[PDB]
Amino acid sequence: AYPEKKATLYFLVLGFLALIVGSLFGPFQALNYGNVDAYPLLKRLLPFVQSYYQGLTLHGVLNAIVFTQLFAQAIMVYLPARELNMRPNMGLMWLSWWMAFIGLVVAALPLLANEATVLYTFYPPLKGHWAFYLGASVFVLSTWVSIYIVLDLWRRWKAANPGKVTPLVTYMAVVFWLMWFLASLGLVLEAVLFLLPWSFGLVEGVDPLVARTLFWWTGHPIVYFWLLPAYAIIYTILPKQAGGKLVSDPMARLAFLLFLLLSTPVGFHHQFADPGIDPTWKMIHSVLTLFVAVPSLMTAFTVAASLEFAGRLRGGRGLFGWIRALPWDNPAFVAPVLGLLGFIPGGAGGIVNASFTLDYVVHNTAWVPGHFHLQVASLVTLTAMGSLYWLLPNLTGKPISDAQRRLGLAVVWLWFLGMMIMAVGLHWAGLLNVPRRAYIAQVPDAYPHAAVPMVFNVLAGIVLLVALLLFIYGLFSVLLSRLAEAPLPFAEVISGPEDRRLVLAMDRIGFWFAVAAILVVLAYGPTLVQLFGHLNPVPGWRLW
Amino acid sequence: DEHKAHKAILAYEKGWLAFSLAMLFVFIALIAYTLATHTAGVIPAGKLERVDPTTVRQEGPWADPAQAVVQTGPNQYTVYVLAFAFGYQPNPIEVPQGAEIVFKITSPDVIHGFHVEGTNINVEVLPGEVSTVRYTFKRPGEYRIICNQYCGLGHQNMFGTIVVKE
Amino acid sequence: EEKPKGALAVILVLTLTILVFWLGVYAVFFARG
Ligand code: HAS
Ligand code: HEM
Ligand SMILES: CCCCCCCCCO[C@@H]1O[C@H](CO)[C@@H](O)[C@H](O)[C@H]1O
Ligand SMILES: CCCCCCCCCO[C@@H]1O[C@H](CO)[C@@H](O)[C@H](O)[C@H]1O
Ligand SMILES: CCCCCCCCCO[C@@H]1O[C@H](CO)[C@@H](O)[C@H](O)[C@H]1O
Ligand code: CUA
Ligand SMILES: [Cu+2]
């Protein structure tokens, strides 16, 4: 009847397992930025770990690449399926899960064998093992099947409902997947044209600049790829969990449409500090980057209004009374909301980085990580943890005990607190110029000036280890323990007379797609044409 | 209640949007400002200037360290720097204060960062390409160079120094 | 009350946070030029 549940569960579990493993290195890294060298200890527990960096590669690959993608494939395929009450093509769906699992296993081997300590960005000339690139490529190509599966679902629903506007969750999933397709081309091109033939030994060198340029083409939109599955839940389900309704269908659609149009053509903002890239082009990408920030600013209001509406609806007292009125008893509700709070400082950090010249102050310092943990490690990861208290029950049939409820609730606050504390230690240490991606605890007297922010980092390191441990507990607890027949908590929407017009305009998906593609060609084409016309491949290195 | 709140939400949405765009344009203006000003010097030159990483330390401006510093005009100086695993050449880098320093940096191996603590100099150094950044240290002293781009196991201990003569 | 007041406060905090971080780093910027 509903074979999509099993597959969805496998994407979710595999994702959470990637989260557990990857995050094991997190605490030791926070202590490291707290000048406390705990890696000798880590090595006694995990004898395969050869260095701080191998540990970091696993951290970034398993959390920012594997866990996030798996959670998105689960959410952005399963929610639209359920909204439409239509079955995804199960042959492709399982095939997509096997590509992810096999690609993962193939990349894992070299990584765990210290054969690819190049970090999740794997910038040439650092040269990793062929199985790393091959496995990563297959893991990522897995999303192309997911894309086909959702467009196929949309296609089938349209056929059966001519003249009708695409339902909300499905509209979000379609532009989301079309956006990802356009975004993935940079990395797919980097892999197929250079990384793969290079690690396989067919070519001796790769051009570093064109490699970073194709990488960042995908590098920025991939975080939007990480974020949107969380935005879909925050827009369409959290309002109900909050005890209210989604105040606006059209604005939600607009936010997603702007992401389809602006997530990809902004990559030079990760290359402000790169040579060979025209300053004018950098300014254009800077402006476009400020624009892609708009969808989230709008989201800030639509979501807040929805939570306010729900608050006042259930006794919402004064100007802030609606806040205490929310279901702070439900972890499913708390997780995403705390995540949105931290997303505030997270976003400001982002607007700063996008400001071209201002980036030179924070680029490559501990600041970037402080900023992005509020983004992916906090908002996104907390929204995913929160789904344990509603999506899992929905997929397994097993409810959440008052105990499991209290635990996860403890996991969420401690996780959010750990991240806020760490965000203080990292932004500060970053303003103090401490470099990111560095084993500074190995050079104890290297940064005396950051002694105080380092205390935060050690503190955060302790808090988060507790959170992770409670999480691993709560997770296996909720799965091995012993509502399923109840639909997903899709919220009701408040419609208006203006809706229709706006909605029909945004429903011209084919047109908006072409516009999104055109924008990418205009933003990257000039630069890439000049790059491929003056390539300078250089030899690889294994400096570990 | 819902429709009344709905009406006020799309209304305030437009205003919010209006304010956001405006605020973003102010930021844009404050960015353009830095561009016209002399601070736009820490911005890497966009012109492609290729070199061979495997021979950079044997033939060319980076080969002889003693030739690293060059006078290219009135109170101006080009400093060919070499970033490698794991350090910088020359070391230290000695340059006059109040002078415009045109740094021309490159790598014979992997990518390195060139972050001069206390300054706005923070540029990625790519093998096969030359990173050209400009800067006038207006105060004497010792400016530590930090490699802020993972480049291998000797990354955390990769430092340089720029002594600006007084 | 019924006015999006609660939401307006949220985007106000947000706006202030963006302003602090921004002008703040902009200051550090000129202080490093
Ligand atoms: C999911 C993860 C991420 C998101 C989302 C994200 C968003 C942004 N980022 Fe970013 N980012 C950059 C710019 C931005 C901008 C402009 C945005 C924007 O999209 C952000 C917009 C955010 C907002 C406009 C805030 C909205 C606030 C909301 C929505 C909360 C409202 C709360 C409510 C409603 C609840 C209220 C509840 C109550 C109880 C009151 C730049 C530069 O331009 C760099 C390069 C830095 C460098 O130098 O290397 C960068 C680097 C990174 C890296 C490092 C990559 C590496 O390893 O090198 C990561 C991982 C990352 C992740 C993410 N980033 N970013
Ligand atoms: C227990 C929670 C966590 C802690 C304590 C933690 C801590 C850290 C620290 C201190 C760093 C900086 C290391 C360095 O710059 O050398 C780091 C980097 C990173 N973390 Fe986490 N992290 C945690 C969870 C996560 C999660 C859940 C994600 C995303 C899903 C994440 C993604 C990343 C990424 C992408 C990097 C950068 C990797 C790189 O630059 O190569 N972290 N984390
Ligand atoms: C790299 C190419 C890999 C191709 C793999 C094809 C797998 C075909 C799907 O098998 C699936 O396995 C699931 C259990 O795991 C079952 O629950 C599901 O009913 C079954 O259909
Ligand atoms: C899809 C399956 C791909 C299998 C690839 C097998 C061949 C791997 C070639 O690796 C090469 O080995 C050389 C000799 O050791 C190194 O000098 C070189 O740097 C490295 O790139
Ligand atoms: C996390 C938010 C609070 C941060 C508080 C500390 C900010 C310090 C910024 O000063 C910077 O210190 C550097 C040395 O560390 C100098 O080289 C640089 O020129 C100077 O601008
Ligand atoms: Cu050179 Cu890090
Ligand atoms: Cu980005």
Q: Which domain holds residue C9?
A: 1-33
A249, B10 Cβ separation under 8 angstroms: no
SS3 of residue A286 by DSSP = helix
Same domain (yes/no): B111, B159:
yes
For residues B3 and B52, state if they share a domain. Answer: no
The DSSP string of A217-264 is: HHHTHHHHHHHHHHHHHHHHTHHHHTTS-BS-HHHHHHHHHHHHHHSS
- Number of folded domains in chain C? 1
A126 secondary structure, DSSP code: B
Query: What's the domain range around A165?
Result: 1-544
Q: How many structural domains are present in chain A?
A: 1
CA dihedral for A513, A519, A524, A527, sign (positive or negative) = positive
Q: How far is C15 from chain B (nearest CA, A)?
A: 9
Beta-strand pair B141-146/B131-136:
unpaired
Q: Which chains touch B (3 or more CB pairs under 8 A)?
A: A, C
Ligand 6 proximity of B155 Cβ (cutoff 6 Å): yes
C3 Cα to chain B: minimum distance (Å): 7
- Technique used: X-ray
Backbone angles phi, psi at B22, to 5 degrees: -55, -50
Q: Name the residue in chain C with its Cα closest to that of B1.
A: C2
Distance CA A459, CA A464 (A): 9
Statement to judge: residues B28 and B56 lie in one domain = no
- In whole angstroms, what separates CA A95 from the centre of its chain? 23
Number of structural domains (chain B) is: 2
- Rounded CA-CA distance B77/B98 in Å is 11
CA angle B144, B146, B152 (to 5 degrees): 145
A427 assigned binding-site residue: no
Question: What distance in Å separates the CA atoms of residue B56 and residue B58, rounded to the nearest whole number?
Answer: 6
B103 in the same domain as B31: no
Range(s) of the domain holding residue B78: 45-166
SS3 A190: helix
- Assign residue B103 the CATH number of its domain: 2.60.40.420
Q: Longest C-alpha distance within chain C, in Å?
A: 49
What is the least distance, in Å, from the CA of B7 to any CA of chain C?
10
Q: Provide the residue type at B161 as one letter.
A: T
In this structure, the answer to whether residues B87 and B127 fall within a common structural domain is: yes
Give ion ligand 7 contacts, CB < 5 A: A 220
H helix or E strand, kind and range, residue A496 = none
Distance of CA A70 to the CA centre of its chain: 10
Q: Ligand 4 centroid to A206 CA: how many Å?
A: 15
Contact A427/A373 with Cβ under 8 angstroms? Answer: no
Q: Which residues in chain B have their CB less than 8 angstroms from residue A541's CB?
A: 85, 109-110, 152
- The single-letter code of the amino acid at A17 is L
User: Minimal CA–CA distance to B158: which of B54, B57, B80, B84?
Assistant: B84
CB nearest to C10's CB, from A304, A349, A357: A304
- Do B32 and B79 lie in one domain? The reply is no
Ligand 1 and A235: CB distance under 6 A? no
Provide the 3-class DSSP secondary structure of residue A344: helix
The number of residues in chain B equals 166
Tally of CB atoms within 10 A around A110:
22
CB-based contacts of A527-531 (< 8 A; 24+ apart in sequence):
A527/A213, A527/A268, A527/A277, A527/A278, A527/A281, A528/A210, A528/A213, A528/A214, A530/B48, A531/A207, A531/A209, A531/A210, A531/A213, A531/A276
Q: Which of residues 146-165 of A touch B (CB under 8 A)?
A: none
Q: Are residues B9 and B78 in the same domain?
A: no
Which sequence positions of A are flagged as catalytic?
Answer: 220, 224, 371-373, 436-437
Please check if A224 is assigned to a binding site: yes
Residue B92 backbone dihedrals phi, psi, to 5 degrees: -80, 175
B35 with B55, same domain: the answer is no
Written as one letter, the residue type at A202 is: L
Longest Cα separation, chain B: 79
Q: Which residue matches tokens 């979000």?
A: A172
Give the DSSP H or E segment for B106.
strand B100-106
> B86 catalytic, yes or no?
yes
> Is A98 touching ligand 3 by the criterion CB < 6 Å?
yes
Q: At what angle do helices A279-292 and A294-313 cross, to 10 degrees?
A: 10
- Ligand 3 near A95 CB (within 6 A): yes
Q: What is the CATH number of the domain that holds B2?
A: 1.20.1070.10
Query: What is the DSSP secondary structure assignment for residue A329, as one 8-state letter?
Result: T
Note whether A237 and A229 are within 8 A (CB). no
> Rounded to the nearest 5 degrees, what angle is found at the Cα of A68, between the Cα atoms of A67 and A69?
95
CATH of the domain at A98: 1.20.210.10
DSSP strand pairing (B93-96 vs B112-116): unpaired
CA distance A269 to A283: 9
How many Å apart are CA A132 and CA B46, to the nearest integer? 33
Of B9, B34, B118, the CB nearest to C4: B9
In terms of domains, do B49 and B103 share one? yes
State how far the Cα of A400 lies from the Cα of B49, in Å rounded to an integer.
62
